Ligand binder design. Structure first.
Ligand SMILES: CC(C)C[C@H](N)C(=O)O
Length: 348
């Protein structure tokens, strides 16, 4: 009987681009695995659930998945969605592997079922905070976050690391997801002589801040994290995006092993940037662990994930006892025009 694997992701709403990364990556992996014989001889059946980046809607999705006999979830994207959804899954026999949720809490609750293919924000903030001190030691820095545990969590980790390395921010402020007029905040930053804005949050608000700062005459460079790795950042911000910095893990589209896979996505009309191959890899981890376990039972797959190593589009993957992957860490990217003439994130 088919192995039912769900993709839980923000298929609509502000983060739809990240939903597409996750959906397209998981769907292609399932197709490729199926063409190779499935998982232990059984075909994968994909079901989709749209969380709209809204924890309440994510919980409805999680319930739908339980009802539909889902055994594994690739998702969700947002930490505030994934953390509550994971409890529903943990209590109903479902293994959850997130390609993109980075808040430490996700794997720090002693749940049997939680895994990631991405890093976590104590790692990410350590890299970011050190970078601020190394390159902007004397700058006046504003730390701004989106009042979510992802965004504020990342901002707080970065703050801790920056402070320890000798950078004391001149502002620390929260804004609400969905708010779009940043004029007052931008004016406050300009008054304070801010030249670096560290942003703990997602691409929509980041793009709005970048665009508005340029228009309002605030000369400041925005530095953020994994939340801004989408072409849509450039679409909102316009050319003012140039020079923006952000942390992200390795860019898997640049791995030589993935050359043909990336070409295939493009032949299907999709640019498989950012988390696309992290989602592809999450599917591959499930398949590899089931093969090692001799079982598709989620609890047995979880045990196998914590024991072995498995081939993936991110490279060979293995997991610690909490479900975090043992993979390369965060690096700093800068936004510049790529070979195709579009602004994108390029490793420094
Ligand atoms: C899609 C990602 C930017 C999500 C973010 N890492 C979070 O944990 O909420």
């Amino acid at each position: 009987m088919d192995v039912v694997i769900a993709v839980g992701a923000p298929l609509t709403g502000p983060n739809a681009a990240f939903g597409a990364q996750i959906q397209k990556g998981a769907e292609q992996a399932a197709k490729d695995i199926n063409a190779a014989g499935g998982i232990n001889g059984e075909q994968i059946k994909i079901v989709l659930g749209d969380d709209v980046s809204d924890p309440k809607q994510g919980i409805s999705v999680a319930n739908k998945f339980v009802a539909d006999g889902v055994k594994f979830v690739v998702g969700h994207a947002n930490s505030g969605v994934s953390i509550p959804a994971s409890e529903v899954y943990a209590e109903n026999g479902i293994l959850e592997i997130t390609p993109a949720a980075t808040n430490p809490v996700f794997t720090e609750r002693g749940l049997w079922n939680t895994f990631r293919t991405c890093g976590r924000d104590d790692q990410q903030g350590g890299i970011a905070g050190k970078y601020l001190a190394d390159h902007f030691k004397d700058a006046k820095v504003a730390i701004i976050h989106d009042k979510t545990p992802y965004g504020q969590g990342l901002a707080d980790e970065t703050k801790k690391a920056a402070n320890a390395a000798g950078v004391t921010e001149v502002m620390y402020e929260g804004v609400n997801v969905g708010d779009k007029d940043f004029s007052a905040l931008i004016s406050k930053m300009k008054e304070a002589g801010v030249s670096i804005i560290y942003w703990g949050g997602l691409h929509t608000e980041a793009g709005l801040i970048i665009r508005q700062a340029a228009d309002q005459g605030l000369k400041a460079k925005l530095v953020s994290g994994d939340g801004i790795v989408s072409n849509e950042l450039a679409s909102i911000a316009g050319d003012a995006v140039e020079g923006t910095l952000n942390t992200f893990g390795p860019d898997p589209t640049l791995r030589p092993e993935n050359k043909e896979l990336v070409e295939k996505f493009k032949a299907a009309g999709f640019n498989p940037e950012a988390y696309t191959l992290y989602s592809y890899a999450a599917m591959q981890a499930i398949a590899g662990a089931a093969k090692a376990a001799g079982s598709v039972e989620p609890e047995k797959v979880a045990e196998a994930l914590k024991k072995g190593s498995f081939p993936t589009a991110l490279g060979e993957i293995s997991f610690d006892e909490k479900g975090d992957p043992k993979l390369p860490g965060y690096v700093m990217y800068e936004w510049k025009k790529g070979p195709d003439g579009k602004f994108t994130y390029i490793q420094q």
